[PDB]
UniProtKB/Swiss-Prot annotation, chain A:
Name of the protein: Capsid fiber protein
Source taxonomy: Viruses, Duplodnaviria, Heunggongvirae, Uroviricota, Caudoviricetes
Range covered out of full length: 114 to 169 of 280
Compartments, as annotated in UniProt: Virion
Quaternary assembly: Homotrimer. Forms a super helix coiled coil in the homotrimer.
Coiled-coil blocks: none
Domain of life: Viruses
Function: Protein that forms the 55 capsid fibers. These fibers are not always present and may have been lost in some lab strains. They may enhance the attachment of the virions onto the host cell wall.
Organism name: Bacillus phage phi29 (Bacteriophage phi-29)
Protein family per UniProt: Belongs to the phi29likevirus major capsid fiber protein family.
S-S pairs: none
Swiss-Prot record, chain B:
Gene name of the encoded protein: 8.5
Family: Belongs to the phi29likevirus major capsid fiber protein family.
Cellular localisation: Virion
Subunit record text: Homotrimer. Forms a super helix coiled coil in the homotrimer.
Stated name of the protein: Capsid fiber protein
Function: Protein that forms the 55 capsid fibers. These fibers are not always present and may have been lost in some lab strains. They may enhance the attachment of the virions onto the host cell wall.
Length: 56, 56
């Protein structure tokens, strides 16, 4: 009868929507895409800014 | 011959109702960490004594 019963993210009944997205994410870039909504701030944190991002 | 209960040598002091897991050298020891639990004692045993346990 198995040994571990590896649950999945959606089995965690009091996890939040952003919380489940973060738990599923594999890389730091993916996490930043979830967490940072302001596109200019995200661009700064990614070290990749256009002239429009810089002005903003 | 699917047994509901086993007779296993105790690796340490086991009390009645204690959840058991593997210890050193195949002996049975008390545990407080679910997933390591394979059964529980219905008998009390010192150390090196056999203890009857119900598998769960």
């Amino acid at each position: 009868r198995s040994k571990e019963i590896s649950i999945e993210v959606e089995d965690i009944k009091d996890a939040g929507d952003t919380g489940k997205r973060l738990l599923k994410i594999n890389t730091p870039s993916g996490a930043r895409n979830i967490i940072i909504e302001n596109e200019d701030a995200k661009a700064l944190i990614n070290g990749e800014t256009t002239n429009t991002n810089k002005k903003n | 011959y699917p047994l509901a209960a086993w007779q296993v040598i105790a690796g340490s002091d086991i009390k009645v109702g204690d959840n058991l897991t593997t210890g050193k050298d195949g002996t049975a020891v008390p545990t407080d960490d679910p997933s390591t639990v394979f059964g529980y004692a219905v008998e009390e045993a010192q150390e090196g004594q056999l203890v009857t346990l119900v598998i769960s």
